[PDB]
Amino acid sequence: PRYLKGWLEDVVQLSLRRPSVRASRQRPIISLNERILEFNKRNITAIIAEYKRKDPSGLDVERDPIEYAKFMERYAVGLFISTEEKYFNGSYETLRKIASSVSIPILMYDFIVKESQIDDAYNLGADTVALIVKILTERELESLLEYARSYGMEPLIIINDENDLDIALRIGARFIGIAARDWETGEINKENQRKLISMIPSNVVKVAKEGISERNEIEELRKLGVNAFVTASGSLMRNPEKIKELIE
Ligand SMILES: [Cl-]
Ligand SMILES: [Cl-]
Ligand SMILES: [Cl-]
Ligand SMILES: [Cl-]
Ligand SMILES: [Cl-]
Fold this sequence. Notes:
Blueprint: H1 7-16, H2 32-41, E1 48-51, H3 65-72, E2 78-82, H4 92-101, E3 106-109, H5 115-124, E4 128-132, H6 138-150, E5 156-159, H7 162-171, E6 175-179, H8 190-198, E7 205-209, H9 215-223, E8 228-230, H10 235-238, H11 242-247
The structure holds chloride ion (5 copies).
């Protein structure tokens, strides 16, 4: 992993030592990027619902994992399931339970730094994972992108700035997540987000990671070419029913 500081460095160290899990997949691969394209083709707003109990820059949230996932199965294009333990209060067991309970795509959201975590995601029932440019060397990215693809999963490469984007396109990523929030400060920069979105080739499936909170903001990024959206952190955990308004 790259040289880091703060909670990011600590979570990267925690990931490096994360034990592999014993489990075997009993679920098809329900591709997230392809389903996003399907929604686009039907002109249906594609919203990826996030299940997260905690955030190093947010407040805690308690809500039944299965209940939430089953509710979202009716509206969301897919789910983001946080599995990082210390700062996000995530769990491999939670991902497994959820994956066994719904038929829509699931992305295991964690800080992937080694192959065994991708094995874990596949074995637990996730359909894909996110790879974060900020914490990975180019070499690690190339290697993890290929490993994920060998399982038939197209990973979501998360970028925060121009250099991140250049590296993503350089290695051949086709599924890119543009983050509106800053990892360390927790600050939202919509302008930077829109700029990066405007620099991405049309054949790359683009996901706006936060940066939108209501239907009208979704409409605007949709015109900039954004394919799918992950809404402002905690908004759906607080008001699940709001997704209906978002995709109306
Ligand atoms: Cl920064
Ligand atoms: Cl802003
Ligand atoms: Cl936002
Ligand atoms: Cl917003
Ligand atoms: Cl209603």
